[PDB]
Design a protein around this ligand. Structure first.
Ligand SMILES: CCN(CC)C(=O)COCCOCCNC(=O)COCCOCCNC(=O)CC[C@H](NC(=O)CCCCCCCCCCCCCCCCCCC(=O)O)C(=O)O
Ligand SMILES: CCCCCCCCCCCCCC(=O)O
Ligand SMILES: CCCCCCCCCCCCCC(=O)O
Ligand SMILES: CCCCCCCCCCCCCC(=O)O
Ligand SMILES: CCCCCCCCCCCCCC(=O)O
Ligand SMILES: CCCCCCCCCCCCCC(=O)O
Ligand SMILES: CCCCCCCCCCCCCC(=O)O
Length: 568
């Protein structure tokens, strides 16, 4: 309860954050209004908010934020000519008016792709007007991503500003700024990818699948927290995620702020690692918590076998609260295993459940159910072992080439840029995740593969090319990676028709960027396999000591004509 929600927001966020969030909020609904129009709206909303700060009883200050926002959206003179049926929302009252606006947000829209200006033009633009530069970009990205959570979009903006101060004063601006902008763009695209992923999965897999995921994830985060606490948090985390997926910023904000506040008022019963997060302002609290490192395990933890295998009442305790029992199992397994992926722990829980359903329908039929856990644990642990002792012996590029031949052969119907992008991406996964010790490797792989495979399935959901790729993308979120890891070579594929122009290279290669020369060689590699999928070869680019001049044509046309018969 609050007399002026706008005054309260302005006070808890502060002028600068307030301004940026309103810009983002207005840009996500008014996607086609120019940067200068959104500036004048922000300035008008800001002047209004300050009158409420000076006086909560000032005219219209006691109206809800949803009310004021919809009112401001309906003052837009061009609303009907530009957004069409979005202007029909203004003929409704709250709550129907806000729900109407939410549904008219264009998930696309149709805007030219945002191109990275030259490093020196970015730094000069940033010098002469840091305000206009960053906030025009904040507006440009907000308008193209209307469903991306506004505070998180502001968090990215402050890291970009920080990338621009550290590098635009550096001797070689490009060398500093370019990896940083790549990091930020890939972090933001990962953030956007996993946002739509958990929302789609909530729709398709049901609240129970979400709550299971949450039990496992929270138990790894807070291993000293009791099951009752973890359960309370799973419940609240489930409400926040369902309401956040519906996409009402304000309702999402309040739910996230509430949960963060609860966690922070109950640190002693949750984790000893929340201290800093809990001192942070309201804007950063939830984000900070979502990102905190796993707390340390209590150490005295006995085996699960006593309550989940030996206990006379395994069936009795299970039958009287099937999901709470399975949730306690997951809690107990997950708190002891921050070394596992959440997807793996979920496999152990579904396996345990399958055993209980059969063995409780005989009782002491289970007991050796903890052996039925070893093959599922060994599987992602052995595949991490294999891929990391493949990255070691080859380096990022040579390994991308090793995975490239693989995925090209398995499912050859997928396009050449997609197969290059995915192998290049999984090459980053190996680079990132294999520099972490064995016990931090599965969450790492999981987190990166969940976005690599999400982006992949998103591509295949729009232009399908394989029935097996549809299966892995439409099977359980728990079987997505093992369904993908079980892909065999297409034994019924018809080799691609040779086209000399897609196999001939010119002088441009020596001058094209390091990244661009690689993509060019990697596309030609996807095609070298698309044409010869029966061609034998272990490690392609740089093998050995393990186990597991040039010319356009003339001298250039030699390889096209020679490898034509020197490969089958
Ligand atoms: C009465 C006239 N006014 C008022 C202007 C006066 O001041 C009196 O003036 C008379 C004397 O003249 C003085 C001199 N005059 C001047 O200078 C110019 O006068 C100016 C004359 O404008 C008159 C016309 N404008 C008006 O009335 C104001 C218009 C007003 N609407 C509005 O702006 C709409 C306000 C939008 C609500 C905010 C949502 C913004 C989003 C919140 C942020 C997102 C949340 C994130 C949380 C994350 C936390 C982490 C979450 C987690 O993740 O945990 C309205 O009507 O309601
Ligand atoms: C959010 C704040 C964004 C301001 C920074 C400008 C981004 C310039 C990089 C171009 C985008 C890209 O990497 O493709
Ligand atoms: C959305 C962020 C909400 C904060 C909840 C904090 C608990 C951490 C668990 C998590 O979100 O993965
Ligand atoms: C109280 C939380 C509910 C307990 C979760 C049940 C555990 C066994 C089922 C695991 C299934 C994985 C989730 C899914 O179906 O996608
Ligand atoms: C490139 C490296 C690929 C990562 C190895 C896959 C292991 C998957 C762990 C997550 C899971 O349990 O499915
Ligand atoms: C499926 C569309 C073609 C794009 C490339 C195929 C990627 C196959 C999924 C790989 C599964 C995870 C990595 C692994 O095998 O450890
Ligand atoms: C059909 C015969 C055409 C011959 C040209 C094939 C293209 C070869 C792919 C490029 C391999 C580069 C690998 C690397 O540099 O590590």
């Amino acid at each position: 309860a609050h007399k002026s929600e706008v005054a309260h927001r302005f006070k808890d966020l502060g002028e600068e954050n307030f301004k940026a969030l309103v810009l983002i909020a207005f840009a996500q609904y008014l996607q086609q209004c120019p940067f200068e129009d959104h500036v004048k709206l922000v300035n008008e909303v800001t002047e209004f908010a300050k009158t409420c700060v000076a006086d909560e009883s000032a005219e219209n200050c006691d109206k809800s934020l949803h009310t004021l926002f919809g009112d401001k959206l309906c003052t837009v003179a061009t609303l009907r000519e530009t957004y069409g049926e979005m202007a029909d929302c203004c003929a409704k009252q709250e709550p129907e008016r806000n729900e109407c606006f939410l549904q008219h947000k264009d998930d696309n829209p149709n805007l030219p792709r945002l191109v990275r200006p030259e490093v020196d033009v970015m730094c000069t633009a940033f010098h002469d007007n840091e305000e206009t530069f960053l906030k025009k970009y904040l507006y440009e990205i907000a308008r193209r991503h209307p469903y991306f959570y506004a505070p998180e979009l502001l968090f990215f903006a402050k890291r970009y500003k920080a990338a621009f101060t550290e590098c635009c004063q550096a001797a070689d601006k490009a060398a500093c700024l370019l990896p940083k902008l790549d990091e930020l763009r890939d972090e933001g695209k990962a953030s956007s990818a996993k946002q739509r992923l958990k929302c789609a999965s909530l729709q398709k897999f049901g609240e129970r699948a979400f709550k299971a995921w949450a039990v496992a994830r929270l138990s790894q985060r807070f291993p000293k927290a009791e099951f009752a606490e973890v359960s309370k948090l799973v419940t609240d985390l489930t409400k926040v995620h369902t309401e956040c997926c519906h996409g009402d910023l304000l309702e999402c904000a309040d739910d996230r702020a509430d949960l963060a506040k609860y966690i922070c008022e109950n640190q002693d019963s949750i984790s000893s690692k929340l201290k800093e997060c809990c001192e942070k302002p309201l804007l950063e609290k939830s984000h900070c918590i979502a990102e905190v490192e796993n707390d340390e395990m209590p150490a005295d933890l006995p085996s699960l076998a006593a309550d989940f295998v030996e206990s006379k009442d395994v069936c009795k305790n299970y039958a009287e609260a099937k999901d709470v029992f399975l949730g306690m199992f997951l809690y107990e397994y997950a708190r002891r295993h921050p070394d596992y992926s959440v997807v793996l722990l979920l496999r152990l829980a579904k396996t345990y459940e399958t055993t209980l359903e059969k063995c409780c329908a005989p009782h002491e039929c289970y007991a050796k159910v903890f052996d039925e856990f070893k093959p599922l644990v060994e599987e992602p642990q052995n595949l991490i072992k294999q891929n990391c002792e493949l990255f070691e012996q080859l380096g990022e590029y040579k390994f991308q080439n090793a995975l490239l031949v693989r995925y090209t052969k398995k499912v050859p119907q997928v396009s050449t840029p997609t197969l290059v992008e995915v192998s290049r991406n999984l090459g980053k996964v190996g680079s990132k995740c294999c520099k972490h010790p064995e016990a931090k490797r599965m969450p790492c792989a999981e987190d990166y593969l969940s976005v690599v495979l999400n982006q992949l399935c998103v591509l295949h959901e729009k232009t399908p090319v394989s029935d097996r790729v549809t299966k892995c993308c439409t099977e359980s979120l728990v079987n997505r990676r093992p369904c993908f890891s079980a892909l065999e070579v297409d034994e019924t594929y018809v080799p691609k028709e040779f086209n000399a122009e897609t196999f001939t290279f010119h002088a441009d290669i020596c001058t094209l960027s390091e990244k661009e020369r690689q993509i060019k060689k990697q596309t030609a590699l996807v095609e070298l396999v698309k044409h010869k999928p029966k061609a034998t070869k272990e490690q392609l680019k740089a093998v050995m000591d393990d186990f597991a001049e040039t010319c356009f044509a003339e001298e250039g046309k030699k390889l096209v004509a020679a490898s034509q018969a020197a490969l089958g």
